[PDB]
A = this chain, B = another copy of it.
Amino acid sequence: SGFRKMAFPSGKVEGCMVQVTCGTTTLNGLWLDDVVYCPRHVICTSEDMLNPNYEDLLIRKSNHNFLVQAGNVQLRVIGHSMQNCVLKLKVDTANPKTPKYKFVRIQPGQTFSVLACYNGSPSGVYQCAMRPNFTIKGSFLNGSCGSVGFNIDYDCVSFCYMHHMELPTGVHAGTDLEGNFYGPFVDRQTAQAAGTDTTITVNVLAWLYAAVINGDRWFLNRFTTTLNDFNLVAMKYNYEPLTQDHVDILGPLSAQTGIAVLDMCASLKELLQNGMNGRTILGSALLEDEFTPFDVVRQCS
């Protein structure tokens, strides 16, 4: 038993991390087959980053301006192109540690593991959720750019995130591995605002199921509700509307506990209206929304 925020084992991704230096800017790249992927701002000086023209900077770079290191081995760059906000560096050696992989674009509310890296070296691993406002609540210092986010399906690494920047509020913003940002952000050092964030309702229900499985059942009431009645209450608390798709996705947890989703919704409606009255749920005084239904099924069976 027990419930913890857990990352995927990072080994298959550790074998893909390299250091990329262009001039005096160093950050991390992801080496898959004979390609290194990194944020395109590796080509900027500190001055450029205030308002960069990436096409103009990349023109004046050669293959030779890119120093790519995997441990004490230099990889020769034999080609380079920009895809949206990501540089692709063709290199002379395919990575023999390349795992089975895919590039995916995740949806808001979904989680992934972040492998935080510095100078091509893995430092730590933790779980993030893609917020409704397309930011993530991470831990990134200078040198972490190019660190990636991923899920594992048995032996297959789904890469979904590459780290680019910190917004003025201290939340984090990045691209998919095609270099398209999540959210309405650009890779320029100028002030950018995220949308108001919202609470991921389906994940709060998942976490309430985890609490029940772990014996925290004080919030369970004898009531049911309708999806419609639930959403009319929850919208006042800035909860995302719960769809039938979400209800369907919670099916496995409803089956594991014998508690109907709309029964749980009635418990959550009461928690939102009445507060936690000085009680905790899985040790927490706040409702947690960064655990998906999958995160809960995976870990709790």
Contact = CB atoms under 8 A, between A and B. Distances in A.
Contacts of A126: 4-7
Interface in A94-143: 115-116, 122-126, 137-141
A1 interface: yes
Given A11-B11, A139-B299, A125 B2 contact: no
Given A2-B139, A3-B139, A4-B139, A125 B215 contact: no
Given A9-B14, A11-B15, A2 B137 contact: yes
A76 interface: no
Contact of A4 (B9, B138, B215, B301): B138
Contact of A124 (B7, B122, B123): B7
A185 interface: no
A170 B214 contact: yes
Interface string A15-39: 1000000000000000000000000
A188 interface: no
A198 interface: no
A173 B122 CA distance: 29
B124 A2 contact: no
A10 interface: yes
Contacts of A8: 124-125
A84 B66 CA distance: 54
A172 interface: yes
Interface of A: 1-12, 14-15, 115-116, 122-126, 137-141, 166, 170-172, 214-215, 280, 283-286, 298-299, 301
